């Protein structure tokens, strides 16, 4: 196979459970698993199922989850229900459930399906049976070893990376959610076998971590990379730092597999976010990573203006497939959600970009200094 030049269309395996959209976090809660069903239905109506393999994930077992999470926390998640909450008030506080991370009907099953897609995708990659695996129900990057955080309960990303590490010496994690990928970075902070790269809003903003001076520790020193940003970053600003940083990371770290969290709360108009990317600017990140021709697990994450989440992950599936799709949306079960325009692509707002071009270049220059410290 010495003739390979690393191009070609890529084999894509996509994971989805038709039950996922029915899980409900509660009245007024911004996290809406329904957006995954909206994404699926939109990409079915564009015909993208003709171009990829579609799999229904298994329900990951408590035991699969305790490859990272503590036994006590997973036992709690398996046991807690809206009808027995009163008896668990102490454990709810200890594991940080019942505020941002509510108890809801089927919580554990939702975690099992989110996680099952990511671990199943990792196995498929390890078996060299696909180039890309996609799980838009995964990417729940804030969950910690023994606590929920940030609408995330089980860290499917950490579990998928642990699976990749069975066959890959070095794994690269890239996080374009507007929030810092703190749960993933914490899990791998002291190893060089996982490099974590997060771009995120930083300053009076959840979760409060991801300073560019957070670079890892011990054998993991220089293997955590954080790009802190201000409100209002736009396509042009993002694209001028993302490809140079990822290219330098690829050059210095030479990973053999990549996990890309595609949290869509970095889009213009997100309910919780303060960035100004379009779907095209967000998806340029997938294009950039895809060109390195490494085994790639693409995951979901945040995204709280759900019409735009469905647009984003539909277009990023098309990008993974190297399929052009029209801007005019096909009819679909959720067509009214996409008015008044009924187009796939979105316009940025007139919000001010507080990330000056000088700020962007200066942060990039500082991270390049840290990347020079790899062997």
């Amino acid at each position: 196979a010495a003739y390979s030049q690393g191009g070609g269309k890529k084999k894509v395996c996509y994971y989805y459970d038709g039950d996922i959209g029915n899980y409900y976090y509660g009245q007024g809660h911004p996290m809406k698993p329904h957006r995954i069903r909206m994404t699926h239905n939109l990409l079915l109506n564009y015909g993208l199922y003709r171009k990829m393999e579609i799999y229904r994930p298994h329900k990951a077992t408590a035991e699969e989850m305790t490859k990272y999470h503590s036994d006590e926390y997973i036992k709690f998640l398996r046991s807690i229900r809206p009808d027995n909450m009163s008896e668990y008030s102490k454990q709810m506080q200890r594991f940080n459930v019942g505020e941002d991370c509510p108890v809801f009907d089927g919580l554990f099953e939702f975690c099992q399906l989110s996680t099952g897609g990511s671990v199943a995708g990792a196995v498929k990659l390890n078996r060299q049976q696909t180039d890309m695996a996609v799980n838009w129900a995964g990417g729940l990057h804030h969950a910690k070893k023994s606590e929920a955080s940030g609408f995330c309960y089980v860290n499917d990303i950490v579990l998928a990376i642990l699976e990749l590490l069975k066959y890959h010496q070095r794994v690269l994690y890239i996080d374009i959610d507007i929030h810092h990928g703190d749960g993933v970075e914490e899990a791998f902070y002291t190893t060089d076998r996982v490099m974590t790269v997060s771009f995120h809003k930083y300053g009076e903003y959840f979760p409060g971590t991801g300073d560019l001076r957070d670079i890892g520790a011990g054998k993991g020193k220089y293997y955590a990379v954080n790009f802190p940003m201000r409100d209002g970053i736009d396509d042009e600003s993002y694209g001028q730092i993302f490809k140079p940083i990822i290219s330098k990371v690829m050059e210095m770290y030479q990973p053999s597999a990549v996990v890309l969290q595609c949290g869509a709360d970095s889009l213009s108009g997100d309910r919780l976010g303060c960035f100004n990317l379009t779907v095209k600017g967000h998806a340029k990140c997938v294009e950039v990573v895809k060109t390195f021709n490494l085994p790639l697990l693409m995951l979901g994450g945040g995204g709280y203006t759900i019409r735009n989440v469905a647009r984003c992950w539909t277009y990023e599936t098309a990008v993974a497939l190297d399929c052009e799709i029209p801007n005019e949306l096909p009819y679909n079960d959720y067509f009214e959600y996409f008015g008044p325009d009924f187009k796939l692509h979105i316009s940025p707002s007139n919000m001010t970009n507080q990330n000056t071009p000088e700020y962007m270049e200066k942060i990039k220059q500082r991270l390049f200094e840290n990347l020079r410290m790899l062997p």
Binding site: P30, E99, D100, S149, G150, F151, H179, F206, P207, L272
Partner: peptide, 8 residues
């Protein structure tokens, strides 16, 4: 991370 409620 919800501005409308809590500390996240």
């Amino acid at each position: 991370x919800n501005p409308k409620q809590x500390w996240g």
